[PDB]
Each structure stands twice: as C-alpha cells, then as structure tokens.
Nucleic acid binder design. Structure first.
Ligand code: AGS
Ligand code: AGS
Ligand code: MG
Ligand code: MG
Ligand code: MG
Ligand code: MG
Lengths: 359, 352, 358, 351
DNA sequence: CGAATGTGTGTCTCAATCCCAAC
DNA sequence: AAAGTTGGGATTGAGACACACATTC
C-alpha cells in the first residue's frame, strides 16, 4: 500500500464553482476562514472515490444555484497512476476510472466496485483510517469494542486477511457445489475414492478458512503488533509533556494510562488528552508498518481542543514524522502553518471559494 | 586589523516546558550575549537568523531584542541579519518581527560592502529558502558570486542546512556554496567550525539549550558566539575565538540502584545553577529523591514501576496445516489469478 | 429560571483534591492548560445538583488514590439561598440540602427530588439548557423534533404552563366527583341549580385546554418565533458571514438564506454551525431578556472558529446584557481580555490548583 | 503653550475580517500623526486604547513605534495612560505600550512640565475596572493632594463617567477632583463640555470602529483635540477640533422603488469608495450590481418582499374569562389554595 | 444485602430516502 | 429517440427491549 494523492479538479461542488488543486508530498496545510471551503475539497475526494449515497444527496453537494457537478481526481497507489472522473449533468450521472492513462471502468457502479478493489477499504473504514474528520481523531479509541478492533484491523493492514476469509468462503462453498455435482451421479466403484478424497479436502479448506479468520491469525498478528505500537505510542506521547508514568495498550487496543497514584482510562481523560492519545496512537501504528502500509493520511483540524502549548509541541511532532509519506492537515490555527511543507490558502469571495496555493 | 562577531539561533520567546524560568533563561542568556558583545567593541555583528522563536513572539521578547540592537546601533556597530525559518512571514500582508529592528539592523537580502580600518569587505546574504525554491536560492548564490570576484575578503550569511552536517533536514548541498572567505550560517544548534573551499565555514551554535538533543553538544563545545579576526588577508581557525555564555545546567540520572543515586546528589550539588533532572527513576527510589525539589529547577524524570510472511506460515504449520498452501493461496486470492488453477493442482498432486 | 451560582467546594473530586472556587456575576472565564481541571469543576456542580448515576461512576469521579468524595454548592434562585452537600465515605453516600441556613432535605433521593422542582429542570434537560459541554454547543440544534421542541419549551419558560395543565387534571377530576355526588345518584325550580354545577365543570376542561400544548403554549411559541428570528439575525450578522438572513421555522429548525439558494445546518461548516447555535441561544436569551434571567455555562465554545470569529464572538459576549452570569471555559486568549473575573487553574502533581482573579 | 488630546486609535482592528478596513485604521492613525507633526504641539496626551489587542500584529507595533519615535525626535513630550485593551491580563506578559517606553511617558502618577516659564501639572493612571474603583479613588484623591499648589492641572483617565456612558461606567461624576482639563477615553463619542470649573473632554475614536459611529462622523468629524492652554484658565473657545478623513459609509433600507434612487447620488457624493450596509429588497439586487466597483463592500441583507397580558388576550379570544385564567395560573404555580378561589367563582360570577 | 432506579448499550426492526440502472 | 418510471441497493433515523453497571432504599 503506497497511496499518495496528486491533484483534483472540481466544478460546481458546493462552494467551489471551479477549482483545480495540486497536492505535494510532505506536510500539506489547508488554511482559510470558517466556511471558506477547506473541508469541501475532501468531500470532493470522497465523492470521487465513492459515489453519492442517500445521505450524500446531490442537492447536498451540487452548488445550490447550479445544476451539474464534475470532479476529476488524480492519485497514486502501490506505484500506479489513477484518475477518476465523476459527473452529474441534469439528472443523469456517470463515472470513469483510468489506470496509467487508459480507461478501466465506465459505469458508476463499475467504478465503485473497482475503487473498493484497489484500496481494500469501503465507505465505512476510509473515514476511520485515511480521512479522519473533525473530532473523530479520538472517536476510534472510545468506540464500541467490536467496531474498535474492526477499524484497528484496517489501519494495521490486517483487513487484507478478512478479505481472504470471505473470498475463502467462496471457495469452500463452491467446492461443496462440486460435491453436489457428483452426489446426484459391469462397470463401477472408482468413485468411493472420491468420497473421502473430496470430503476430507473440504474439511481441510474450512480448516484453512479458520486460519484467515479474525480470532485465528488476525487476532494473533494483532497481538504480535501491540508491543511495538505501545513503545512508539509512549515515545510520541511523552512529547506532549504530560504527567503520567507510561501509556499501556491492551491487546484489545483500549488504552490505560498510568498515573503515580492510580490508573485512568480514556473515559476519565479530558478531550485534549484524548486527542493527544489518538494522534500519538495513529502515529505509532504508522511508525509500525513503515513498509507494509505506507499510506497517506488526512486530518481535519486536529489541534482543536488542544491548548497553545500542545499545538506547538504537536507541530514539532509532525516535523519529526518520517513514516507517513504525505499528510494533509486542515487548520484554522496558525500553529501549523509555520511547520508545513506546502501551504494551500483557500479564500472565499462571497459564496464562491477560490484557492491560492503557495509552493 | 578588524574583528567581528558571529551569533545565531537565539530563539527569543522559547517557552520550554511552558515554564517561566526556562523562558527567562533565553532572555538572560541573550542579554548576557549582548553584554559581552558590548564589552568586546566589535566592528560588525553578523546575526545569521532565528533571533526570535516565532513569527508572533511575545511583546517582552520584542522589547528585549529591540533594546539590545538599539544598544548595538548607538555604539556605531553595524548589525547585519538574515531572516530565519522561524521569522519568515507565512502569510502575505503581515510583517516579520525583524521589521521592528529596521533602524538598528540591516536586514540582508543582497549585497553590501564595508570600509573598516582601510579595507573593503564584501558581505552578502539572503533569507531562509524552503527546500522547494532551492533553484531560486541557487539563482541568488550565483548572483552573489558574480558580484564578489573583485573583493579578496568576502562573507556569506545563510540560514540553511548543508548536506554533510545535517542528513535529516538539509536544504542545500556543499557544492552549491561558492568560494567565500567566511560562511556565517545558522538553523542548526550544534556549534560547527571547519575549513571549507579555501575558507572557513562556521555554524554559530544556539545561545541557550533549546531542543533536548543539544546538550550532547553543549558539554563538548560550549554555547555562545564566535569572535573572528579578519586582520590577515585570509582566515584560519587560530584567529577565531569562541566566546561561551553560561546556560541552564541539565543533569541526567538513571537512578534505578543506590549506586546510581550518589551520582545524582553529588552532581546536583556540584553544578553551577539550579539544574534540570530527567530520565528514569524507580518508584521505590523517587520519594527519597524528592527531597531535592528545592535545589533543582524542574524534574522531568519518569517514575518507573518495578515480516508477516514468515509468521503466517509458522502459524499455519503450528495449527497443523500446510503453510505453503496457506501462503501461496493468500497471494493467489489477493491478486485476480485463478484460485481454481492453483487449488486443483494441490487437490490432485499434493494432497492426502 | 432566575438561576445564579455562588461558590463551590470540592474534596477528592477527580483531579481536585481540595478546592473552593468563588463565582461572580458577569463573564466568568476559566482558563488553564489541557487536563488542568477546568471541565472537572462543572462535572462537580452537576454532581451536586444530581447524584451519581451509572453514567456518573464514583470510581470515575473519585480521585484515583482516595476513597471518598465531598462537595458543597451555594447558589441563589428566585431570591432564595440554597446549599447542597453530597458525600460518599467508604461505601455509603449521603446528602443534605439547606435553604437559607436551615436544612430542607436530608437524603440523596430527597435532595434530587427537591432540585428537580426548584429548578423545574431534570438531569437530562439540564445539559441542553444551562450546562453545555464540549462540541455539544450544536447538540441543542440537532435534537429530535419532539426533543427539540421539548427543550425549547424549557428554554422559553413555556414549560411552567404544562405544570398547570397537569395540575388542572387534578383539579378538574376533583370537581367532577362533586358532580358525581349528584350524577351517581340521579337515577335508579331547584333543578336549574343542578345544571349550574354541570356547566361549571364543563368550563374547567376548556380552561385546561387553554394551558394545554396545542392551546396557549403553541400560540405563545408561534408568537415568539419572529422575535428570536430578529435577535438571531442581529447576533449572527456580527460574524460578518456571507448570508442573506437566517430564517427560523416555528418548529425551531434553522434555515440559512444564501443568494443563489437556501442551505441548512447540515451543509454549513462546523464553524458556521457553531455560529448559528451560539447566536440562536443568545437570541433565546435576548428574547426573554427580563422574563427568564438564566445563567449559562459553556465549555470551549470558540472551538472550530477561526481567529476572527473568536474575536467577534468576544465582542458579542461583551455586548450581551440579557444573561446575568455566563461562565465560559477556554484555552484561547480571545476571551481572557473580555472577562470581568478570570479563574486560573493549573496542575502540580496530578492535582489542580485554583487562583481567582477579580 | 498648546497640547493635543487624542485617544482610541484601536490599531490592529480588522473589521469585517477585511484587509482594507484593517489598513484604513493605520492610514487614519498615520494621518493623525502627520497633522500633529505639522502642528508641532508642545505636549501630546494620548488617553488610552492605542492598540486594539494585547498582542497586536507586528505591523501595528512597527507603525505606532515609528510614529511615536517621530514625535519624540521633534521634542514633543507624549504622555499616555494604558487603556482597557492594553492592561496585561496574565502574569508574565507585557503591555504593547512597553515598546514605546523611550519615546512616551506611560502615566501612572504625577509629572510637572516647564513650558516657556510655567509649571503645568499632568497626572494620570491606567484603566481601572469597575471592581477596583475603591483603589482608583485613592489614586485620584492623592492626585488631588499633590495638585493644590498648581493653578494649571490636567487629569488623564481611560474610564467611563456615569452621566456620559450609562451602560458601562466605572466612575461617577462627583468622584472627579477639580482640574482645568480632563483628557479621557474608552468611549468613542466625541464629547466636550464644562465640568468643575474646567473642561471635560472625550477625544473619541480616530476611525469608525463599531457601526454606531458613522452617524457621528457625518455630524461630528473624527480626529483629535488641539487645546490652547496659554492663558491662565481654560474655556471651550480655545479648543479646536481636528477632523480626519475616514471611510465613507452609505446606509440604505431598500424596501421600495424610490430607495434605489438614493443610492448612486450618495455613493458618488462622498470622498472615497464607501461601504454600504442595511437592507436591500431582493428584486433590486441584480440591477444594483452595476456599481459594485464604485463601492468597497456591500454588507447589505437580501430581503424577500408581556405574557401575563397575552394569556388573557388568548383566553378571551377563545371565549374564556382571562382574569380567571391568570389568577388561577398564579394560584397553582404559587401553590396557593385554588380550592378557596374556585369555590367562589361558581357561586357569584357564572352563567 | 437484594430490589427500584434511570442510564447507557447493542441490536433489531419497520420505514423512508435517494442514488443507480434499466424499459 | 426521447422522456420519465421503476425496482435493486445502502444507509439512516426512530422505536423496542433484553442485558449490564452502578447508585441508592
Ligand atoms: N450546495 C451548496 N451550494 C453552495 N454552497 C454550499 C453548498 N453546500 C455547502 N455550501 C457552503 O460551502 C461552504 C464550504 O465549507 P466547508 O465545506 O465546511 O469547508 P470549511 O468550512 O473551509 O472547512 P470546515 O472543516 O467545515 S471549518 C460552506 O460555507 C457552506 O455553507
Ligand atoms: N479519578 C480521577 N483521579 C484523578 N485525576 C482524574 C480522575 N479522573 C480524571 N482525572 C484527571 O482530571 C483531568 C480532567 O480535568 P478536565 O477539567 O476535564 O480538564 P480540562 O482542563 O477541563 O480540559 P477540558 O476543558 O476538559 S478539554 C485530567 O487530567 C484527568 O487525568
Ligand atoms: Mg532554525
Ligand atoms: Mg534554530
Ligand atoms: Mg476603551
Ligand atoms: Mg475603545
């Protein structure tokens, strides 16, 4: 997983009547007013990857005056160059998916299925791994247990084994169909060998499907992943200068913090300390799979709920981060402009958003 | 027959640990640097960036720096400065803090020549260029090259990182630097001094300990500024004396035994000022060390209590299943290759 | 809701091992670093008003080293001075509630029962009106329709009429039995006097319908909407935002009028959402500027707002005269400079310390 | 022997989140300095609110600094008192005025000046909040005791006096001791009137800060005071008001077709390209877009096209005795005897 | 101590909505 | 041919309810 964004164009997308925005590698800072148009850019990225949903109304995302919507997106993943073009004219919609120039998919549902095949992440877990929205930096840690490990698998690159679990269900059940194709069916008896031969083989196939399961090897690999993530989590957490012994991470990825005369959980912490643990944990996971899932990461206003000091120290954290190839951060704060590699300024003339990028 | 002062990386306004004392230590060390500079009476002061720590520093830091460079300008000392990375304005209409020093300091973004005791010396410099606009920086340097050949004495002021000194975040290489008699550089807080291209390349270290990775350099080579004697036609290390200022002492201790506890107390007592302790200490040793929270400034010490490709096969074989099949099948399914063409081979050939 | 807080004392409550904090009438600003004990104070007040729930765990609110918790709270409402006292010793809990020196309640459930009637607000609706937590500034906007108008009824002081409508059910029924005393017997001249009482009891029910939901409550709310819309525009325009005007439906759902279309709070940015929520709460306050002089508590409202919107918000708070005492928590300096009393809260060894500046 | 009374510059105020409105303050301030230098007054009294914030932008600090350096270089003594936006709120941080320490005397006490052979008494203090008035009075009474010897005396305060600003006043009128002149601030209404055998004066703001102050600018120009204290006493005659040029504002309440004609002739008959605000009917906006270049910005709205009394009103509208509804409404909410009150109504006044 | 409580949680449902493809 | 019409699909909100956790008599 070598995923990096390149550039995106958009027409009549909410406040953006027409905007072309190129991305670069490193610390990318999106700055602007409230309602200037910062988040709309990533609403557009999400629109290009996955089509509009029922909650993602077209009336929600078309420019309230206009009637059409056009968005094309250029990105790279595992070394290949891809380009998506989604449009909606006056009632009809369309989607195109190009790979290194030539087209791969031409219908909307075809593009959707294909995008879900290249990223390995659906609608639900792309907002918990790569595009973290407002406040949800720490939501993943206080989440419901099953949901918590469900997303932990995705940001760890473990979901690649769940895909093998279900696609393995395909094979087990289809080979069983190959048993039913035989069951209904001075020459005789060379099929008694096939009963044991295929039945024991299907028991073997299910016995392998349990290896790829959650509680099988996913939980095991997660166990072997915890210690490293704990050490990195404390290394990055101590940069917040907080008054705690050390940060303990359970096998189930629920966090316990060691105070001198007690032990606290995320339930007790303050919001800003939650955000601290969250960013330090995502950076620990990123530092763990330095080559397995060298993925880009997008943050929408993370320094919110952080004081002046924690904002500064967090910036000095982001400067030392070398595991994430491209991190795009949106902020209304000046504590991150000074540390960024590329500053994308987004102003708004009345109700239309205009972008001035400084290289 | 002249002398000048090379100083950099003062980081006025740096509030380490959000602590008032550590904020005042930077102001004090800077004031004392100004004091020693006033004691020396140098002809020119070359400040090569990072005077302030932020683009919007506190009013107190602005007052301190202002009164310092006013002291320098009223004494007929010309001060040249180049903007640092912490001083380059990020937005458009807002101004850099160095604009408050316009009447006492020449902010260098080009060339200038000075007559000192009967000899023309060429000074040139530019602001901090981010790694993106290096070619622009190069286009400035070659320009500063063409305007320099007439002068046998020349100095270059830059606030960048050169490759052979910082591998982490360097913005220029060594071969991009044209030949100059002296290189007054900044942005790295390890004090560096070495020969370079028939000249002297120098990084004036920081004035106070800013980032904690810089005490490793403080005890070897003290922090302060450089005093350079450009009397001879050329420059050597002999006529460069480094003037060290006194900083806040830091004491590192690893008290997990009682043999490592005398190392603490005997050093905390045998140091100049109220030190800063950090590291790890066993919780059964911490409370009997807390007795010295009066002879220390602050205590930043920890209280301590008391790839997959191999593991998948190891796991599958440990469960009793051909891990070669589990792995080759895992790769067969992740791609869009025929799982049937791969499994039928196993069921026919290598099955039991 | 003529609500005002006076002072609070707390022992072993979360990070505050011991702290007495004095409140003042005006813009009381609580400042500190992250996790320095700012929100913990309001968690303490909420503990004083309403006992510990399952959501309000003792192990959660006990100081992790200690084993007991004590908190008393002085406040005034409608002219009366009250003192709430709650403690948990070693497994058993107790509570005392004094009214002007002498005690009023002596058990925990008795204290809760008294609080809910003196305030006219319960535990859950107290979080949507007086004590607004972090990020939950817009929670009052996005509430369920029934829940939205339900909390709006309390916010406008209409809810008290319901207290009559239910008590009328006690009254009407009673006057019905005095009629049953004639009706349950008139089977198995002065006959006109029999009809007098019947017509009277019939009068009582229509009077009950006056106090009912669809009767005068909805009528007064419908007459209240334009005023809150006017004030809402007055405060929202202070954010120099590019929108025609802010329409407020009678169902208290907000619509923002753009030049080439109409947007809703869903489409607005987080910051614009906060702009609308705050300016609407202040529109409700300014609507009943003298009718319901309620106090307001906010925990980081300037979050998601840029530099300019934070500043403008400060000036808005300074011009607000409708709320007698508003207590705001912030990590931002934009509100230090506008407050009258500034309460600085720092932390030493996991223990918070309070320094009051008048 | 003449001095200038100026206050409330609010440097750094960025109205409407707009760059031009931030610059206009700098221009009006620079122009005030320009006129002051053109006059060459003996003393400049700045009575507070020079900056808008405690941590103003670097540009505003440079502008103010170079301005007061110019004033000090021309042998003009400037006295200032800290305003409400300039009193440090936290511990270690400094007021912005500390950057001007070597060109301006920050007044927190007394000082005497010799002007062509005459002792003039100047005194002043910073902004005292309404809580610490008792300390302020002790500062004022001291300034009284040290003043009885001097026939010429002036008091610099950055407060609000009761009979002039009723909203947020921090001092009353009778607490002010006798002085020949009162150099005050914190209210942007330009005020000048006699007070205790002297002249009390609010120099007012320099640029339109809050929107309630263009109505003043058309009536009362904004700027500073030039006072002639040459004679032994002071009157209104020897005080000349100096007006500065500000940003024009155009107010329109377009709900009719005649309210579009008022626009162009007013927008052109003003000094600089103005700022329009108010209400414009939706049907008029597209035909209003033709002159959006001869305007700065248009903060105008697009427009499309007591319970105790109202309860009785409602009850009578439904056909029910309102006074009964109200008296009962009080009887049960105050938990009074509704039995004793209901039993009477059925007897006397029913049908 | 066990029952009465509200408080939250997980999960399940019918129902609506709106995108998306097809005739 | 063209235009709406129409069912497949996905998610979401409100409404139910057993299962816990913890306070409190
Ligand atoms: N359909 C639409 N037509 C026109 N404008 C729209 C539409 N939908 C939304 N908007 C406006 O577009 C603007 C975009 O703001 P956002 O998308 O939130 O970006 P942002 O405010 O810069 O980032 P954040 O994270 O939300 S603060 C807002 O002011 C919306 O009111
Ligand atoms: N039982 C406990 N014992 C000791 N400390 C605790 C306990 N529960 C929580 N804390 C601490 O109390 C602090 C929480 O105080 P808060 O008031 O929430 O912080 P804050 O300053 O208000 O920041 P905000 O406003 O909540 S973002 C954190 O530092 C917790 O670690
Ligand atoms: Mg540097
Ligand atoms: Mg540096
Ligand atoms: Mg003022
Ligand atoms: Mg003012």
């Amino acid at each position: 997983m070598s995923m990096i964004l390149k550039e995106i164009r958009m027409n009549n997308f909410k406040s953006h009547v027409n905007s072309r925005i190129k991305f670069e590698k490193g610390i990318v800072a999106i700055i602007g007013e409230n309602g200037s148009g910062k988040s709309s850019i990533f609403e557009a990225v999400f629109f290009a990857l996955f089509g509009a949903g029922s909650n993602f109304n077209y009336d929600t995302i078309i420019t309230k005056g206009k009637k059409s919507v056009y968005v094309e997106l250029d990105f790279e993943v595992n070394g290949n160059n891809y380009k998506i073009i989604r449009e909606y004219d006056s009632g009809r919609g369309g989607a195109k998916l190009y790979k290194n120039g030539k087209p791969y998919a031409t219908t909307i549902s075809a593009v959707n299925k294909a995008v879900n095949e290249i990223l390995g992440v659906d609608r639900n877990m792309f907002l918990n791994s790569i595009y973290i929205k407002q406040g949800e930096i720490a939501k993943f840690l206080s989440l419901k247990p099953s949901e918590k490990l469900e997303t932990v698998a995705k940001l760890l690159g473990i979901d690649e084994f769940e895909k093998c679990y279900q696609k393995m269900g395909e094979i087990v059940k289809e080979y069983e169909k190959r048993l039913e194709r035989i069951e209904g069916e001075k020459e005789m008896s060379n099929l008694e060998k096939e009963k044991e031969k295929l039945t024991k083989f299907v028991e073997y196939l299910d016995k392998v499907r349990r290896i790829f399961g959650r509680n099988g090897f996913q939980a095991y690999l997660r166990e072997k992943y915890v210690p490293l993530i704990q050490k990195y989590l404390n290394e990055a957490f101590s940069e917040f200068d907080l008054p705690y012994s050390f940060v303990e991470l359970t096998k189930d990825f629920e966090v316990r913090v060691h105070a001198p005369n007690g032990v606290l959980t995320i339930d007790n912490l303050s919001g800003g300390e939650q955000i601290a643990v969250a960013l330090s944990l995502r950076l620990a996971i990123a530092n763990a799979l330095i080559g397995n899932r060298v993925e880009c990461i997008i943050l929408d206003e993370p320094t919110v709920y952080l004081d002046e000091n924690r904002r500064a120290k967090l910036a000095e954290i982001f400067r030392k981060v070398k595991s994430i190839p491209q991190m795009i951060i949106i902020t209304h704060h000046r504590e991150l402009e000074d540390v960024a590699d590329v500053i994308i300024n987004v102003k708004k003339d009345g109700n239309v958003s205009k972008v001035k990028i400084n290289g | 027959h002249m002398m000048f002062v090379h100083i950099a990386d003062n980081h006025l306004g740096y509030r380490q640990y959000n602590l008032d004392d550590r904020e005042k230590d930077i102001y004090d060390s800077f004031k004392l640097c100004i004091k020693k500079i006033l004691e020396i009476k140098p002809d020119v002061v070359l400040h090569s960036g990072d005077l302030f720590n932020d683009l919007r520093p506190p009013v107190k830091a602005l007052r301190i720096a202002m009164q310092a460079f006013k002291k320098l300008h009223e004494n007929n000392i010309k001060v040249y400065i180049v903007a640092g990375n912490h001083e380059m304005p990020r937005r458009l209409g807002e101004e850099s803090p160095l604009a408050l020093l316009k009447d006492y300091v020449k902010i260098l973004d080009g060339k200038d020549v000075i007559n000192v005791n009967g000899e023309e010396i060429f000074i040139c410099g530019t602001y901090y260029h981010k790694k993106s606009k290096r070619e622009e920086m190069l286009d400035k340097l070659k320009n500063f090259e063409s305007e320099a050949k007439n002068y046998k004495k020349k100095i270059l002021m830059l606030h960048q990182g050169i490759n052979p000194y910082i591998p982490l975040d360097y913005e220029l290489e060594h071969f991009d630097l044209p030949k100059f008699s002296y290189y007054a550089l900044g942005h790295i807080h390890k004090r560096i001094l070495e020969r370079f291209n028939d000249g002297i390349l120098a990084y004036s270290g920081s004035t106070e300990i800013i980032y904690r990775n810089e005490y490793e350099d403080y005890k070897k080579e003290g922090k302060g500024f450089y005093l350079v004697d450009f009397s001879g036609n050329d420059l050597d290390i002999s006529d460069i004396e480094k003037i060290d200022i006194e900083c806040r002492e830091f004491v590192e201790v690893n008290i997990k035994d009682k043999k490592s506890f005398n190392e603490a107390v005997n050093k905390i007592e045998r140091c100049k000022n109220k030190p800063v302790v950090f590291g790890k200490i066993k919780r059964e040793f911490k409370p009997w060390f807390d007795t010295l929270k009066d002879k220390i400034l602050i205590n930043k010490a920890i209280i301590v209590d008391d790839n997959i490709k191999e593991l998948l096969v190891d796991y599958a074989n440990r469960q009793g299943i051909d891990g070669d099949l589990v792995l080759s099948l895992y790769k067969a399914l992740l791609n869009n290759e025929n799982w049937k063409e791969l499994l039928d081979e196993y069921y026919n050939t290598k099955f039991r």
